Design a protein around this ligand. Structure first.
Ligand SMILES: CC(C)n1cc(C(=O)NC2CCOCC2)c2cnc(Nc3ccnc(-c4cnn(S(=O)(=O)C5CC5)c4)n3)cc21
Length: 302
């Protein structure tokens, strides 16, 4: 019926990698910064180590996440490097040194221009289109779940809820009412993600309890038009929030729409001091022991 999943699950020795410091902690668990020094391979790979107490239910959930994360392979999606089998199972992933996109847009607002915002939209749509090709429904797309490798390269992560074909404020109305999840319900969440970027990290429907959201959507209320957004960009966000799921754009169409806009960004987003803004590039001073350091994107198979 469905094709065999021949993805390799790499088991990494505790001795092969080190924790440096905690990068973040919360409901999602705890994520540490680290260095992976494999075999006699003469490489140092910057890594992120995730662990969501030693309980069998936690280990079951993180292995479900590992299953999905080891099965993906796209430049705009985060792949699992391996797992470490300690009392609590750890996920070994690529270090995304600029953290999540949500915090990034709040912290770097004054230096984020139309080109960056539109390019991020294309990249998120590319990653989501890839997950659709792989018949995977994310079920938790949000700006918090998009990580920043460099300011010009973002990837989708957090496969903890991903399934083959509760964040109410990012959910499609069918998802809230009937628990119906599809690629088109992911498109709704994509629209909310775009709204989060265009508002430089605003909280969707702020102050409104999650219990009131379904009723607000049924009345026909939607997230407001962000100040920087032209009707062209807002109309796209609005189509992602249509009641009829089949009336919403497809990720392949969102790639096209945002790409055309990305060719003339100042026509589609109005930002004071645009094009005069600067963000860190891998061609800048002190962007990167240093010797033998290889990014995970350049470290292919053992
Ligand atoms: C706490 C997290 C968001 N974090 C903060 C980082 C970091 O470097 N932060 C610094 C940024 C610059 O300022 C100082 C902190 C950082 C760097 N690299 C990764 N690496 C990956 C790669 C692939 N997947 C994941 C992953 C999967 N699930 N989750 S999660 O459960 O945490 C999800 C809800 C968000 C993360 N992490 C995660 C990182």
């Amino acid at each position: 019926g469905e094709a065999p999943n021949q993805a390799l699950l790499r088991i990494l020795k505790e001795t092969e990698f080190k924790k440096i410091k905690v990068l973040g902690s919360g409901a999602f668990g705890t994520v540490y910064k680290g260095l992976w020094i494999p075999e006699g391979e003469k490489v140092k790979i910057p890594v992120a180590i995730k662990e969501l107490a030693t309980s069998p239910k936690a280990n079951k959930e993180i292995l479900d996440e590992a299953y999905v994360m080891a099965s993906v392979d796209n430049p705009h999606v985060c792949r699992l490097l391996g797992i470490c089998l300690t009392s609590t199972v750890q996920l070994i992933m690529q270090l995304m040194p600029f953290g999540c996109l949500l915090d990034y847009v709040r912290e770097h607002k004054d230096n984020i221009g139309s080109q960056y915002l539109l390019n991020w939209c294309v990249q998120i749509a590319k990653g989501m289109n890839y997950l659709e090709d792989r018949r995977l429904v994310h079920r938790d797309l949000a700006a918090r779940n998009v990580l920043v490798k460099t300011p010009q390269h973002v990837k989708i992560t957090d496969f903890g809820r991903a399934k083959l074909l509760v964040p109410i404020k990012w959910m499609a109305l069918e998802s809230i009412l009937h628990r119906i999840y599809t690629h088109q319900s992911d498109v709704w969440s994509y629209g909310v993600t775009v709204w989060e970027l265009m508002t430089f990290g605003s909280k969707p429907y702020d102050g409104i309890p999650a219990s009131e959201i379904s009723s607000i959507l049924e009345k026909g209320e939607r997230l407001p038009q962000p100040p920087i957004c032209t009707i062209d960009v807002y109309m796209i966000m609005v189509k992602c929030w249509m009641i009829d799921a089949d009336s919403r754009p497809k990720f392949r169409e969102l790639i096209i729409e945002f790409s055309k806009m990305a060719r003339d960004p100042q026509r589609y987003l109005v930002i004071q001091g645009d094009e005069r803004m600067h963000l860190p590039s891998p061609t800048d001073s002190n962007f990167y022991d240093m010797d033998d350091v290889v990014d995970a994107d350049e470290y292919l198979i053992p």
